[PDB]
Amino acid sequence: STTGLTEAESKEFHGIFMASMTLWFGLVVLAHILSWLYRPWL
Amino acid sequence: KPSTGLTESEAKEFHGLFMASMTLWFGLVVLAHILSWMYRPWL
Amino acid sequence: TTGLTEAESKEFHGIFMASMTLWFGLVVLAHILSWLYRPWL
Amino acid sequence: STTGLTEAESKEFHGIFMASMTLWFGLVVLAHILSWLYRPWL
Amino acid sequence: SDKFAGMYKLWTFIDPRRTLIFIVAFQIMLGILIHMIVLGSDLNWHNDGIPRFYSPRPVDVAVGPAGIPLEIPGSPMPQARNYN
Amino acid sequence: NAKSFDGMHKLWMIMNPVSTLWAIFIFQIFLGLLIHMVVLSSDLNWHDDQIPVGYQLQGETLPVNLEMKAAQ
Amino acid sequence: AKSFDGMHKLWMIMNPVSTLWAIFIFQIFLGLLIHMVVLSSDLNWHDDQIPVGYQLQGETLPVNLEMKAA
Amino acid sequence: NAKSFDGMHKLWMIMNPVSTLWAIFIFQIFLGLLIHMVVLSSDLNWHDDQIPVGYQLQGETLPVNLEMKAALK
Amino acid sequence: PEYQNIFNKVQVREPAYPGVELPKGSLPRVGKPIFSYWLGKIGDAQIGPLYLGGWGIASLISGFIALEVIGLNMLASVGWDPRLFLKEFFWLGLEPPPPAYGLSIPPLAEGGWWLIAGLFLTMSLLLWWVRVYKRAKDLGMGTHLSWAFAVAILFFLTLGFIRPVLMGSWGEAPPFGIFPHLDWTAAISIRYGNFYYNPFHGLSIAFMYGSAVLFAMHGGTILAVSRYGGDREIDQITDRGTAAERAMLFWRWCMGFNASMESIHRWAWWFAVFCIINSILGIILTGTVVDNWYLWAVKHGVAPSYPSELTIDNPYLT
Amino acid sequence: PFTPFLLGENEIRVSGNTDLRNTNRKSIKQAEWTFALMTHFSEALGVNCTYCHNSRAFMDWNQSTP
Amino acid sequence: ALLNFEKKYRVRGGTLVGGDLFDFWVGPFYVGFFGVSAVFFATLGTMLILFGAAIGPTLNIWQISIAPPDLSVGLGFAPIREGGLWQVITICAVGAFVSWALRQVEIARKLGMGLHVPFAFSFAILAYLTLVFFRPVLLGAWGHAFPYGLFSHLDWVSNVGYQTLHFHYNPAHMLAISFFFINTLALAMHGSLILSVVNPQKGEEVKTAEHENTVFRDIVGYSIGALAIHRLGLFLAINAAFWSAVCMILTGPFWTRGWPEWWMWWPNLPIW
Amino acid sequence: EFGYITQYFDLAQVTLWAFWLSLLSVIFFNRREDKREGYPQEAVQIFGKTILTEGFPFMPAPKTFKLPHNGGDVVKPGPERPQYDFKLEQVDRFAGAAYRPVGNPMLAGVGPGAYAVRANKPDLTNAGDPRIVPMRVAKHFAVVDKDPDPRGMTVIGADGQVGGKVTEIWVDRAEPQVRYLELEAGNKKKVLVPIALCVIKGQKREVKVRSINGIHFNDVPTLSNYDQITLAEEDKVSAYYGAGTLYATPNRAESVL
Numbered sequence A, D: 001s002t003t004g005l006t007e008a009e010s011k012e013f014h015g016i017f018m019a020s021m022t023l024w025f026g027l028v029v030l031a032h033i034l035s036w037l038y039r040p041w042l
Numbered sequence B: 001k002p003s004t005g006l007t008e009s010e011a012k013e014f015h016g017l018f019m020a021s022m023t024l025w026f027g028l029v030v031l032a033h034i035l036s037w038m039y040r041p042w043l
Numbered sequence C: 001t002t003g004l005t006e007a008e009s010k011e012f013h014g015i016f017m018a019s020m021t022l023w024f025g026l027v028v029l030a031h032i033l034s035w036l037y038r039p040w041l
Numbered sequence E: 001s002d003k004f005a006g007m008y009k010l011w012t013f014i015d016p017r018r019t020l021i022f023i024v025a026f027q028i029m030l031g032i033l034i035h036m037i038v039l040g041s042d043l044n045w046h047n048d049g050i051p052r053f054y055s056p057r058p059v060d061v062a063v064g065p066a067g068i069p070l071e072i073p074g075s076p077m078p079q080a081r082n083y084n
Numbered sequence F: 001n002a003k004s005f006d007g008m009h010k011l012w013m014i015m016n017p018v019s020t021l022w023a024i025f026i027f028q029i030f031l032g033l034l035i036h037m038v039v040l041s042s043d044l045n046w047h048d049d050q051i052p053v054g055y056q057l058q059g060e061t062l063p064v065n066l067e068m069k070a071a072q
Numbered sequence G: 001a002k003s004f005d006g007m008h009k010l011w012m013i014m015n016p017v018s019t020l021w022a023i024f025i026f027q028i029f030l031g032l033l034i035h036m037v038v039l040s041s042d043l044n045w046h047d048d049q050i051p052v053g054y055q056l057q058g059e060t061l062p063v064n065l066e067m068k069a070a
Numbered sequence H: 001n002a003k004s005f006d007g008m009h010k011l012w013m014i015m016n017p018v019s020t021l022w023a024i025f026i027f028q029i030f031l032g033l034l035i036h037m038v039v040l041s042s043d044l045n046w047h048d049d050q051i052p053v054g055y056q057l058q059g060e061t062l063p064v065n066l067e068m069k070a071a072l073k
Numbered sequence I: 001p002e003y004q005n006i007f008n009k010v011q012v013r014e015p016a017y018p019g020v021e022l023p024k025g026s027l028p029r030v031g032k033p034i035f036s037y038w039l040g041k042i043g044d045a046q047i048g049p050l051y052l053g054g055w056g057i058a059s060l061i062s063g064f065i066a067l068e069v070i071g072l073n074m075l076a077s078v079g080w081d082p083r084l085f086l087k088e089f090f091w092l093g094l095e096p097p098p099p100a101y102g103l104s105i106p107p108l109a110e111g112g113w114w115l116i117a118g119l120f121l122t123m124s125l126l127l128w129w130v131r132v133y134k135r136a137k138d139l140g141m142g143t144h145l146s147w148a149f150a151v152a153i154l155f156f157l158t159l160g161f162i163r164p165v166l167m168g169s170w171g172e173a174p175p176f177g178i179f180p181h182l183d184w185t186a187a188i189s190i191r192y193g194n195f196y197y198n199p200f201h202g203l204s205i206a207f208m209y210g211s212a213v214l215f216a217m218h219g220g221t222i223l224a225v226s227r228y229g230g231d232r233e234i235d236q237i238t239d240r241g242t243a244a245e246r247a248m249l250f251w252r253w254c255m256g257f258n259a260s261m262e263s264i265h266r267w268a269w270w271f272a273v274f275c276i277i278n279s280i281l282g283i284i285l286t287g288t289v290v291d292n293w294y295l296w297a298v299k300h301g302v303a304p305s306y307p308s309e310l311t312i313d314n315p316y317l318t
Numbered sequence J: 001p002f003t004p005f006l007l008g009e010n011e012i013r014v015s016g017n018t019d020l021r022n023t024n025r026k027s028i029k030q031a032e033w034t035f036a037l038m039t040h041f042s043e044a045l046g047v048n049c050t051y052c053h054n055s056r057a058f059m060d061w062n063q064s065t066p
Numbered sequence K: 001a002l003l004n005f006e007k008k009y010r011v012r013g014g015t016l017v018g019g020d021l022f023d024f025w026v027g028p029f030y031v032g033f034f035g036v037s038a039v040f041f042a043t044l045g046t047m048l049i050l051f052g053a054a055i056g057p058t059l060n061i062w063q064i065s066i067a068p069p070d071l072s073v074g075l076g077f078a079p080i081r082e083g084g085l086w087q088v089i090t091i092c093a094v095g096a097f098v099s100w101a102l103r104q105v106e107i108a109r110k111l112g113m114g115l116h117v118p119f120a121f122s123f124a125i126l127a128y129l130t131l132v133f134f135r136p137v138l139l140g141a142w143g144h145a146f147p148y149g150l151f152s153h154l155d156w157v158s159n160v161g162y163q164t165l166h167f168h169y170n171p172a173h174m175l176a177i178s179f180f181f182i183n184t185l186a187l188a189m190h191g192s193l194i195l196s197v198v199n200p201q202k203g204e205e206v207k208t209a210e211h212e213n214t215v216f217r218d219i220v221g222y223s224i225g226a227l228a229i230h231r232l233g234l235f236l237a238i239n240a241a242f243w244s245a246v247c248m249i250l251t252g253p254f255w256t257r258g259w260p261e262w263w264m265w266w267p268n269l270p271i272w
Numbered sequence L: 001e002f003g004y005i006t007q008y009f010d011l012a013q014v015t016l017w018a019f020w021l022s023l024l025s026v027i028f029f030n031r032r033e034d035k036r037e038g039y040p041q042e043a044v045q046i047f048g049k050t051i052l053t054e055g056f057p058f059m060p061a062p063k064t065f066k067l068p069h070n071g072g073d074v075v076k077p078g079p080e081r082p083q084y085d086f087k088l089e090q091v092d093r094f095a096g097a098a099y100r101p102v103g104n105p106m107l108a109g110v111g112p113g114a115y116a117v118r119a120n121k122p123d124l125t126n127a128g129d130p131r132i133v134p135m136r137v138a139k140h141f142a143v144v145d146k147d148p149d150p151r152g153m154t155v156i157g158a159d160g161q162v163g164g165k166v167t168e169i170w171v172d173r174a175e176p177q178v179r180y181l182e183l184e185a186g187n188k189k190k191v192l193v194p195i196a197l198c199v200i201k202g203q204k205r206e207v208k209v210r211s212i213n214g215i216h217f218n219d220v221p222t223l224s225n226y227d228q229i230t231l232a233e234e235d236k237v238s239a240y241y242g243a244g245t246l247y248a249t250p251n252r253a254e255s256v257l
């Protein structure tokens, strides 16, 4: 491999990466729901 | 492959203290904002 | 590396914390005097 | 010792440094007492 | 709690000299900045005229019907203003 | 359409994870600053809208300040 | 709910020293910036003349008023 | 806490004394100039306050200068 | 102090070098090379020989016809007097046609000579372009000097031919003088509302300042490591020595990033070319798309707004 | 510049009232004739452009002097 | 991070002030006494520019402006809100620029090379000091210097230019512009030539110094040489800066008419 | 109406965006070309481990220079020749600390006295001959009168002492100019000095070399064959003279003020 990671290491990294990205997007959605309740823009 | 030379035990130790410190910092931030809202509400 | 052993780090930490506490004490005193003279909030 | 000073040399330097700083601050206080007598600012 | 007991280990990979230098420099910079921000405000204490003013006070100049100072009828140069 | 994203984890066999993490973090901070400044420059601005009250105007009309401006 | 188990291994690929320094410097810069952005708005707290205006207080002291009368 | 500062003299085993002395001196001179300039820009200015007398105005109203300006017209 | 390497202290001569051999079928080089002691104090002392083939003769006939025309009209404008020519030389010029003639061909003493000189100067520069290209390509080198030359020619044609045609008048082009062309510069800024609020003008000024900065930096850095053989850049590129290493450490330590001995020349190339690209873009939009650059800048939130205090009454509204 | 402007009656204004291309058809030569007359205004009174204009907008009356 | 070859060059010594206390690196940068000074002054200046924007009408990047005092202040000290902030920032700026130059000198001494780059930087510094110090002192007031703002220092440049009816006819201005233009031309030709010699026609060998001489002798008839073009470069850029400083010290202090009227000395020579 | 607006979007605006994107993209390509020398870089980790990092943006794919006269191919970015054997001690225990030389600083090859490891072949002319040669091998050169011929002069060495005497001039045939002076030292060896480190006084008939001291001219590196010089030898000679700018006197590396 050209990153040096094996396939097991890649699987591990991918698991945690996807979990983290999902949590981040959840927080973004929550922020937008609050903003819409306070000051609707459309 | 990029490594830091920390084993898994050292990483666990660092992570423990890092999370504690970050939680304390965010606590102080929340307190500052509650005081500011009581004094001069902005929304 | 920073080269410090664990004993040297303990020593440095002791004195660092003492100094920082003294500095913050002096800051608090300055602000109490300023509030007594010219309150800003 | 990273500066090459031993502990005795450091003690010596510290003694004279603290004495000098105290004398300097004394002169500063005197200047401010004179200025307050001439033109009070608070 | 007891979760902060191993914080001294911080100095085994962060070194004292650079850290002290950074801290001292930053504190002086911040000191000067805050004094200048409060001086440029309503809380200014050098120029407030308390307990008394010490320098002479500004004197305004009367204007003409065009809103600028009047010309003087034999001066070999026009009159100054600062506002347009 | 149930097995078409199976080998996706092999992304990390061609992209370096640490470089990618740093790039993502920096890009996110830049975008955060940009969107906040774009919304602050519009009608949706929330610092200067004088809601729930105007504070400079509130300070100009305090009785003490009014009485001091009168005696002048 | 056990999806974040290996998270502590983050510091085996990311350098702790670089991360710490980056965080500290970014936080100081952001602190200065937000204070300056709020001071330039209607929420400014140094010049709002609350709880009292001090320049105006100095212009109306009897010592200054009696001299300006003369 | 009567004992928490006694290792302080070890400071000079990690900070060079001569470098520190030079830094302190230069900083003090810069700060002296700066504070003098900041106070001279305010109502407390002591060169232009015309106390105890205004000297340019004193020169404009000398009898010799007045007599020379009169005999011009 | 130490030798600064600004002048050559000791000079040496060998017989002149005729030049790398050209491909078979070429013309010989004309001239016998001479040596200059004063030029040798600062650089290379040989002058000549020179290569004159097909394209560089057609160029040089065109250019000299143009020069004869320009010179003679400047001389007719003072009544043929050479004394007055020398006396008032910076104020003379050959002027474009009156704008009411449009794009037609005007009579000869009312703008036709300007048109002739412009045509001949154009042809001269395009023939020179072909010469520069072929000269570099016959020796087996990359043709990078032709790309930059093409950019410069395009700027000359934009202000002068393309913009006057898009506007509908030859009288929108510069004249051939010294003070006359300075007057043209000022007037076109005054008519289209202040070039300081043209954004392409600001960007080209950024790149002209940058050209001066970069070339001071590069000239300094290579003179400062010439004691380690740094002035020989081809060898430092194909076999990195200590001169290149020191040169790149200096900038890395000073400002945090660096280039290599070959890459800095790409930075030079681009900084010189973006200046002129923005020149073209700024002139081509003036008049044809934007009529007042200050009002444009006000519409797009760019211009500051000084406090007023007064009211002035527009007398056309009264 | 006195024949067209101080005995004849020609338009001195050359700049536009909007930012994009409109009905304005003045040229750079007309701009030069205006520049000439303004040079004489400056010399005859002992002043500069800024005695009556702000150079950043020579055509705005709200940014001129009295 | 260190380059492949960097470690053997990172030795101690070569400094001007300070000594062993500030002789370290932070990442790729080298710090020193003057590194600390420069970052201190840059941070302070930036923060004061930002505060001066906060007390103004807008935080739009293009419309911020901090202005100098009035001409009635003379060479004195202005109030903070009406000129004193400009004075403090203009002290910080000088401090930062000189620190930058001296740090360069320390670095060059450590690497064993000549001081050509800080010396060429000195002329930029000199032009700045002409605009903020020398010209104001000779004319008698700080309020003759330019304000700090994009778009707002351009209004200064414009009006100052038109205070002489036509600033294109300033002689030292003409000479400086000549040097600027010739410098851009020379930089284009130098860049092109080196690129062309190490990137030849497809399937050829890297060319030599003889090729470099031959190409320009074929096109133009003269070639200056590989070491003299670097000299010619330092020369043209420095001269541009120098004559800019002269042209500004002439305008106001030594000439108060229009600039076209200076040139009148030439057609009035009694020799035509 | 003086400032009436018809439409907000125009062509100047779009074109400006296009330029912002065309810059911002030559920066990308130039920054990638910048990293064909010296990379991947070495990042030191929390407790001393070193890894190779590559930066932002990443390194380009290798290109080849074909050198003339069967001088081989050069791939870049490619391998590196091995460093020699410098010895250094760090001064303070952190990754960003400085280093001290261990032995005699003049003969150590560290600091301003470091050099590169180049080929052991001479630089060639367009005809295949060695480029830098003494004036007895190049039989067509001559010093222009009007200029002081340095052959014969002495080589005073920065502390006032004599180093030796000039016996030859080394010229450059591709561009005719002087590159080195050859001199016989105090122990009767033949050593070179670069012409860009020499101040030549014609009337005093001296050459002043401010870099090193008089006794230091005995230990300048020597050449294999005296009819040519190779790239490696050029580097060694020049680096030895550059080490003296900081190591000649014990007071040279010691904070002016």
Ligand code: BCL
Residues within 6 Å of the ligand: B025, B028, B029, B030, B032, B033, B036, B040, C024, E034, G024, G027, G028, G031, G032, G045
């Ligand atoms: C109208 C708005 C309010 C106001 C609303 C807020 C709000 C909301 C906040 C602040 C916060 C801060 N404000 Mg406030 N603030 C006001 C006016 C001021 C004035 C002034 C001159 O007027 C000053 C000087 C301050 C200064 C400060 C700082 C103490 C703090 C940001 C520090 C930081 O950036 O950490 C960056 C540094 C680190 C991350 C360092 C990490 C650890 C280091 C070694 C220790 C740092 C000590 C830290 C500064 C203080 C923590 C408390 C200690 C126990 C003493 N504010 C006005 C009155 N201010 C922030 C805060 O409270 O932080 C909790 C914050 O959220």
Ligand code: BCL
Residues within 6 Å of the ligand: A024, A027, A028, A029, A031, A032, A035, A039, B026, F025, F028, F029, F032, F033, F039, F044, F046, G034
């Ligand atoms: C009218 C519009 C609203 C507003 C509408 C929104 C909307 C909509 C959003 C924000 C978001 C944010 N707002 Mg807001 N916001 C307003 C006013 C403010 C003000 C202020 C001074 O007025 C401030 C300082 C903020 C600041 C913030 C940040 C906390 C956050 C952007 C994060 C980021 O850039 O991550 C970029 C950096 C990274 C990704 C690096 C990695 C981050 C690591 C893992 C940890 C960082 C934690 C982060 C700070 C969040 C903390 C959550 C914890 C659970 C406590 N807003 C006004 C009132 N704001 C965004 C957000 O909430 O994100 C969740 C968002 O979507």
Ligand code: BCL
Residues within 6 Å of the ligand: I185, K097, K124, K125, K127, K128, K130, K131, K156, K157, K158, K159, K160, K161, K162, K167, K168, K173, K176, K177, K241, K243, K244, K245, K247, K248
């Ligand atoms: C109507 C106005 C007039 C006009 C009025 C003026 C006025 C007024 C001036 C000029 C000046 C100049 N004019 Mg003019 N000029 C006009 C038309 C022209 C035209 C043209 C094509 O028409 C050209 C080509 C020029 C060209 C020039 C240059 C000769 C000169 C500017 C270079 C300079 O000052 O460098 C000098 C360099 C500096 C001042 C830079 C200082 C550098 C500092 C030390 C470093 C700063 C670092 C920074 C803070 C760091 C940021 C760091 C980030 C991390 C990146 N002018 C029109 C006719 N001109 C200027 C001049 O000569 O000043 C000396 C000047 O004042």
Ligand SMILES: CC[C@H]1c2cc3[nH]c4c(c3C)C(=O)[C@H](C(=O)OC)c4c3nc(cc4[nH]c(cc(n2)[C@@H]1C)c(C(C)=O)c4C)[C@@H](C)[C@@H]3CCC(=O)OC/C=C(/C)CCC[C@H](C)CCC[C@H](C)CCCC(C)C
Residues within 6 Å of the ligand: I059, I060, I063, I064, I124, I125, I128, I132, I145, I148, I149, I151, I152, I272, I273, I276, K181, K182, K184, K185, K188, K189, K192, K219, K220
């Ligand atoms: C990328 C933009 C920069 C640039 C690039 C550039 N210019 C170039 C090139 C390049 C890459 C060439 O290869 C080409 C060349 O061959 O130069 C060696 C050239 C060239 N740019 C030249 C000049 C030039 N470039 C200028 C500008 C610029 N050139 C830009 C700043 C200017 C300016 C700023 O005004 C000038 C005056 C010529 C030396 C040369 C093209 C020669 C040519 O076309 O000559 C053939 C035609 C004739 C007129 C023959 C008749 C005799 C001539 C009058 C002799 C030339 C003498 C010289 C122009 C004296 C200056 C006179 C002025 C004071 C009026």
Ligand SMILES: CC(C)=CCC/C(C)=C\CC/C(C)=C/CC/C(C)=C\CC/C(C)=C/CC/C(C)=C/CC/C(C)=C/CC/C(C)=C/CC1=C(C)C(=O)c2ccccc2C1=O
Residues within 6 Å of the ligand: G025, I213, I214, I217, I218, I219, I221, I222, I244, I247, I248, I251, I255, I256, I257, I258, I259, I260, I261, I264, I267, K026, K029, K030, K031, K035, K036, K039, K042
């Ligand atoms: C500011 C802040 C928040 C600080 C906190 C950080 C802390 C705590 C400390 C850090 C330590 C210190 C002392 C840092 C100081 C640095 C800081 C902060 C800022 C400075 C950065 C700076 C001034 C950068 C400006 C860069 C710019 C715009 C350059 C303009 C010119 C330009 C575009 C050049 C590109 C081309 C290059 C790279 C030229 C260099 C170059 C040239 C010129 C050659 O001739 C040459 C010859 C042979 C080989 C290589 C080279 C070579 O690389």
Ligand SMILES: COC(C)(C)CCC/C(C)=C/C=C/C(C)=C/C=C/C(C)=C/C=C\C=C(C)\C=C\C=C(C)\C=C\C=C(/C)CCCC(C)(C)OC
Residues within 6 Å of the ligand: I067, I068, I070, I071, I072, I075, I103, I104, I105, I115, I117, I118, I119, I122, I156, I157, I159, I160, I161, I173, I174, I175, I176, I177, I178, I181
């Ligand atoms: C007395 O002197 C003698 C006769 C002995 C010779 C001496 C020569 C001397 C002293 C000359 C002095 C010359 C000077 C000072 C010249 C100054 C020149 C300057 C500074 C000029 C600056 C700008 C001019 C420009 C940019 C002109 C651009 C013109 C262009 C692009 C023309 C385009 C026209 C075309 C392509 C032709 C179209 C025509 C047609 C036929 C298609 O129309 C339909």
Ligand SMILES: [Ca+2]
Residues within 6 Å of the ligand: D041, D042, E045, E046, E047, E048, E049, E050, E051
């Ligand atoms: Ca007070």
Ligand SMILES: [Ca+2]
Residues within 6 Å of the ligand: B042, B043, F046, F047, F048, F049, F050, F051, F052
């Ligand atoms: Ca609000």
Ligand SMILES: [Ca+2]
Residues within 6 Å of the ligand: C040, C041, G045, G046, G047, G048, G049, G050, G051
């Ligand atoms: Ca308040």
Ligand SMILES: [Ca+2]
Residues within 6 Å of the ligand: H046, H047, H048, H049, H050, H051, H052
């Ligand atoms: Ca007084």
Ligand SMILES: [Fe+3]
Residues within 6 Å of the ligand: I218, I222, I233, K190, K194
């Ligand atoms: Fe180069």
Ligand SMILES: [Mg+2]
Residues within 6 Å of the ligand: I175, I180, I183, I184, J032
């Ligand atoms: Mg004209």
